[PDB]
Structures are given as C-alpha cells and as structure tokens.
Structure 1
C-alpha cells in the first residue's frame, strides 16, 4: 500500500548551529478507505514526541500524501544517532520502519585543491575553473563558489565519487568569461564538512 521515504538533513543544516537540521518522513500512495496515517519517531530506540505532522493532502492520482518532520540536534546527527520513522496505516500488514543516520565510518579531513583552466581551453570564450576535494568522509559535504565576496551563478558540482581507500572525492566547475580570468579575478571554492575545523575552509584561484 503506502510507500515510506525518509530524507536525511541537508549537509549544511547539521554543520551550522544557525541552521536547523530536520529529518523528513514522506508517505505517499494513501487510499481513501484507509487515509489516516500515524508516525512514530525513535532516536537510538527511544521514542520522541517533538515532531510536527501536517494534515494529509490529496494528490492528483486519487491518493493522499502525508509528511512528518522531526527536528534533530546538530551534535546528535554528527554523533550519528539513528532516526526511525514508524508509519502505521490500517491498509498495511505491519507498520513500516525506515531508519536513516550519518554514514558509518571515520570522519576524515577533506583536502581542497583548485586547478587553473587548461591552456588548450584558453582559445575559447568560456574557460573552466576546477575545485578538487578529496579524502573526505562521509559523503555529506557542501561546495560553493564566490568571487569578490559575492557568490557566482553559473557553476556546477559533480556528485561525490568513492575512491579505493574508503574516501570520497568530487569536482566543481565554475565557467567564467576569458576576460574575467585574464584580469586576475579571484575565485574561491568554499567547502563545509564535519571533519573541517569550524566546518569551513577556503582556497583562492586566480590567473
């Protein structure tokens, strides 16, 4: 019957005390004969009652959709306390228990490196700026680009890729006009991760 999907807090939310991380328990495919949905939240097996469940909203294919949000602490997620969403519906045989938490392993300090555009690409109107981050663990990390103190708009970040040593890596490309690079403009790659001290480090890139 109903399908339960659990979404972890975003990487930036847990790493910054200003932001508020949340775990989302989305349930879809809810029929009208059994529309009521009940959520049970557990933290390391201990039930909590500080969640906020919103009323069911009917979708466009004759089914409802219910979302339950549990607020988590910054250190609790960084300590990896598992969060279990137990969804109970009268059409289900047994309540569905979905569990998610931080990736099991040892936090390794990320290594951020920046690469200038290739000399062959200098003949084009568009050049590529490369930010290489390697050796970080777990895979939840934030990569951003800014210049002159303001963020850049047209940049892309590749998904993390697991290496052979048990750590992840990814690439970030910022494409700017060749005139901007030749004028010695400073482009920086901001990286936020759990292993980083204060969860922040930065490297500058320029001609």
Structure 2
C-alpha cells in the first residue's frame, strides 16, 4: 500500500472552540487487519478514531484529534500503518513570517442589485503564511452560499484571495447586514470581519 497524511483545517486550529484533527488515509478486501499507530514528536498517542472503508472500485481512515498549540508551535505528527514493512507518514506546520490580512468588502454594481440574485465580493490581501479561512454571515447567522478562490502568491511575497457570496435581492432590500469573516494567525483573536448592507 501507500499512505497520505492531511493537516487539520486552519480554522479548526486557530479557533479554540473547534476540534482540529490530523488524518491518515491509507490506500491498498484481501486482509482488513491494518493497525494505525500515531506519534506527536515521537511520543505515541492512543486517542485516534479509526473506522473502516472497504472500497469496491480499500482505504482506512484514522483521525487524531490534536491540541491546537501543538500544530501552531510546529510539532510533527506521524501515523504508522500496519497490515510488507509498515508505512510511515509525517506532517507539521513549518515556521516562517506572519503578516495580517487586510480585508475589504467591495460595494456591488448597481446593475447587479437589479437582478433577483447577485454576488458580494470580499477581497483579502497581504497575508502570510498562505493558510486562511474565509466564510460569511447574514445578521450574524452562518451563511453558506459562497465560494472562495485559492490563495495567490502576490509580487511582494504575501498572498491574496477573494470570497464571493450569493445573495437574494429580497434579503438585501430588507436591510440584512452581510459580513465577511476571516480567520488567520496574524489577526486579533485570530479573526476579523467586514460588514456591508443596502444601508
């Protein structure tokens, strides 16, 4: 077989209310006896959840809940898998500079406020490292009809991205406050928002 190790979501590690996880997905019915051991800076940990997946097209999935600060301070996380000789797989957050994002919600054209539904754009600029989470709300309630671009390497070595939220011309005209909510390690309490409305 061959294994792939994935990082926690950056929003989960920066938000103490959330549950970050390191995930080990191992590729390759014959035998379903495969043990997955886990290590943080080479000390074995026994708290992972593993559930099995027989694929018809196997892959087993083991998720290690992690301490937020272990990821942030750069520890690695390793998964050793068993079922030849066993496969190792490591992962960590590398060290480097931090620059806070600048966040801007852009007013939409008028010709768009005409349509039954139109897009609000949030522009996020000047940040390092590139990992970032961007989502939206409406009157403080979680909103989901948005899409983010991938981050792009800008000329000064920082990153930028945009987020686009779809809105109902009816919800806008009733005075709903829309906000772009951005989570990044360079921000106060790891979060910042920008608001726009009809108003």
Q: TM-score range by the shorter chain?
A: 0.7 to 0.9
- Structure 2 residue matching 1:113: 3-state secondary structure: strand
- Structure 2 residue matching 1:121: 3-state secondary structure: helix
Question: What is the distance in 2 between the residues matched to 1:151 and 1:54?
Answer: 30
Q: Does 1:140 align with 2:139?
A: no
Q: Does 1:128 align with 2:128?
A: no
Q: Does 1:108 align with 2:99?
A: yes
C-alpha offsets along residues 76-130 of structure 1, whole Å, 9 cap, x if unaligned? 11112121222244xx3x4322222224421221111110112443443332211
* Contact 2:51/2:62 (<8 A) preserved: no
The root-mean-square deviation of aligned C-alpha atoms, in Å, is 2.3
In the other structure, the counterpart of 1:9 is: 8
State the TM-score, normalized to the length of structure 2: 0.85
Aligned residue pair count: 198
In the other structure, the counterpart of 2:68 is: 74
Which sits farther off after the overlay, 181-190 or 112-121? Answer: 181-190
Match of 1:202 among 175, 193, 197: 193
Unaligned runs of 5+ in 1: none
- Structure 1 residue matching 2:62: 3-state secondary structure: strand
Change (3 A) 1:129 1:80: same
C-alpha offsets along residues 160-191 of structure 1, whole Å, 9 cap, x if unaligned? 22222222211111122335445554211111
Q: CA deviation at 1:7?
A: 1.6
Match of 1:51 among 47, 61, 75: 47
In the other structure, the counterpart of 2:155 is: 164
Question: What is the distance in 1 between the residues matched to 2:46 and 2:186?
Answer: 29
Question: What is the distance in 1 between the residues matched to 2:112 and 2:172?
Answer: 12
Match of 2:87 among 79, 96, 100: 96
Q: CA deviation at 1:41?
A: 2.5
Question: What is the distance in 1 between the residues matched to 2:125 and 2:103?
Answer: 7
Question: What is the distance in 2 between the residues matched to 1:123 and 1:20?
Answer: 42
Question: What is the distance in 2 between the residues matched to 1:57 and 1:187?
Answer: 41
In the other structure, the counterpart of 1:36 is: 33
Change (3 A) 1:85 1:149: same
State the TM-score, normalized to the length of structure 1: 0.82
* Contact 2:100/2:128 (<8 A) preserved: yes
